[PDB]
Symmetry: C3
Amino acid sequence: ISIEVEDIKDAGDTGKRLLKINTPSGARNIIIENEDAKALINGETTNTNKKNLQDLLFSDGNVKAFLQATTTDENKTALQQLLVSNADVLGLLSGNPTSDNKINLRTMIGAGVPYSLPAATTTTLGGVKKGAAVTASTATDVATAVKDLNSLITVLKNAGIISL
Amino acid sequence: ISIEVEDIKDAGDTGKRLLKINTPSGARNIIIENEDAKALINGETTNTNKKNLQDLLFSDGNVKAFLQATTTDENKTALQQLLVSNADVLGLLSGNPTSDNKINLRTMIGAGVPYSLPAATTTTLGGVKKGAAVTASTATDVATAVKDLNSLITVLKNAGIISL
Amino acid sequence: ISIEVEDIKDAGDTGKRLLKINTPSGARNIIIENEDAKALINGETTNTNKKNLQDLLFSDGNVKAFLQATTTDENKTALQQLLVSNADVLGLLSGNPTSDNKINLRTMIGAGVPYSLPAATTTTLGGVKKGAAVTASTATDVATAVKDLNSLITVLKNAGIISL
């Protein structure tokens, strides 16, 4: 004979809807209630569907922000920590390393600090200024020879080559 | 009585296929047309299925390249920007920092530039060369004393300790 | 007339279960056997479901560790390589750059090494120590003038300003 779907007395509501349906798309529309999941199964997702599916797939919020390609400075700090273990390198990646990080980063690459040349002292190597010009001596008496020696001494004193 | 599936006159084509099906796998084969989605639901995905599902799940192409573990230099630039906000650090991560980035990176870690010791001038602290040997004086007349003074002067001039 | 589901003689086992089912949730429970996939479709995933879905979606183990927000040092090395192409920068990100990496990292940012001021030599610019104090000369004879010259010479010798 011929019966119809509604003649089947113990069929369920969804069961009768499925029996009447003609295509797979129609069946998916009955079976899948979550609109984001339905969109994935249909291979047709909006950016909103994608974000919502990412919420169903991943627990970590910093990972989720990365996957959305939109990260805050806090998300970036956490993501840096997933990528790099060295604390001083993490300081560098923040753009704001601590004093300790800075020292350790220089050590890490063998870099020095800005060097400033200190003046010579009696205990410590240093720079000097060059002494003023001094004429060779043509002295024929003691008085003049002493005058010329003293001119050299003052020049060396003036340039901080010898102490006062 | 006994009826068969095709006796149900208002059943749909997919509906009759489902009513005849014996297992859940058979039902999934009817209902899910997208082969990548079907593969996910079956828990059996090839690398191609995985790439195609990633295309359905994520909009950002640089994120997608990261998830495929294959990034171009352009993808890497964009991913760096998702991970780090400091412009000078981004310059470092590129391997090709600008002049401004280089200055700022040194500031950031308190590093100096390569130092070259300049010669002393009359205005500016600097290095000198060490003067040649000079004998102590045993002069008993003015002529010799002057000779010995002049020997010291020339030595200091030769080493650039005093000006010509 | 009235028939029941079990009167349909060529219905399949899953087909009869679906025909009896009343709701979409009930239909999903019949059709989807993989518990992680069912959880995604129901929009209700535990952390275990999420990890298991990530296993179905991504092939690369280092990417998977990143997505779980739990990376080993080995995972971090591999993820760094997906993010940065410059070998010397990768050395920095490891926290343990090689000697070659260190040289190249300094070059990259225009940094110098720690500078140590060398003593002056007869060939090479260097620092000096400042000479001890020397009194101006009040000599009225050759013997004293020579004494004063020699005092200057010794002071300059003592400070390594001139050679012995």
